[PDB]
Design a protein around this ligand. Structure first.
Ligand SMILES: CC1=CC(=O)CC(C)(C)[C@@]1(O)/C=C/C(C)=C\C(=O)O
Length: 171
């Protein structure tokens, strides 16, 4: 199911990419009810409640579909700021899509789709999160390098999402 979407994206989808584009998917299992995980992920205006590298986020007006956020990130990264647009938010089906449309970083034409799914983990309510992205390969890099570096960032985000969710769940 999870491993299945990951194999389809890394193979079929990667086959569909432009030569200067790459794509992958990450799966994370989280020992918390879907309501808790979804309540964190859906907050387009508050990524810093679980994304470890976001220092600041500004949204003017309601964080509704089509809005923009400006995020500042912590020191130590090849970036200081990113402007991102909310492309999709479906509270009934639990799907979130974003596109990065500006900033001083190296990710051009980055789009992500994140979905959240209910499951059982050791006889308890759990949640599976799948996040997939497509992004351009910056000039002097390869698809592999770009994918692995972006994957590291998403894994940090989903691990932190899991930690926060499971902490909240134990209450
Ligand atoms: C942590 C970081 C480092 C960069 O080099 C680019 C950028 C500033 C966009 C970024 O916020 C990337 C965040 C990503 C890929 C996904 C997300 O947050 O859902």
């Amino acid at each position: 199911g999870g491993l299945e979407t990951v194999q389809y994206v890394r193979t079929h989808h990667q086959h569909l990419c432009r030569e200067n584009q790459c794509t992958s998917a990450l799966v994370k299992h989280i020992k918390a009810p879907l309501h808790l995980v979804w309540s964190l992920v859906r907050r387009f205006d508050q990524p810093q409640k679980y994304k470890p590298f976001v220092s600041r986020c500004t949204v003017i007006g309601d964080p509704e579909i089509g809005s923009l956020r400006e995020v500042n990130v912590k020191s130590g990264l090849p970036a200081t700021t990113s402007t991102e647009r909310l492309e999709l938010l479906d509270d009934e089906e639990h799907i979130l899509g974003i596109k990065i449309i500006g900033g001083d970083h190296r990710l051009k034409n980055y789009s992500s789709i994140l979905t959240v799914h209910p499951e059982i983990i050791e006889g308890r309510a759990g949640t599976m999160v799948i996040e997939s992205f497509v992004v351009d390969v910056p000039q002097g890099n390869t698809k592999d390098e770009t994918c692995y570096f972006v994957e590291a960032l998403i894994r940090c985000n989903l691990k932190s999402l899991a930690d926060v969710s499971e902490r909240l769940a134990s209450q």
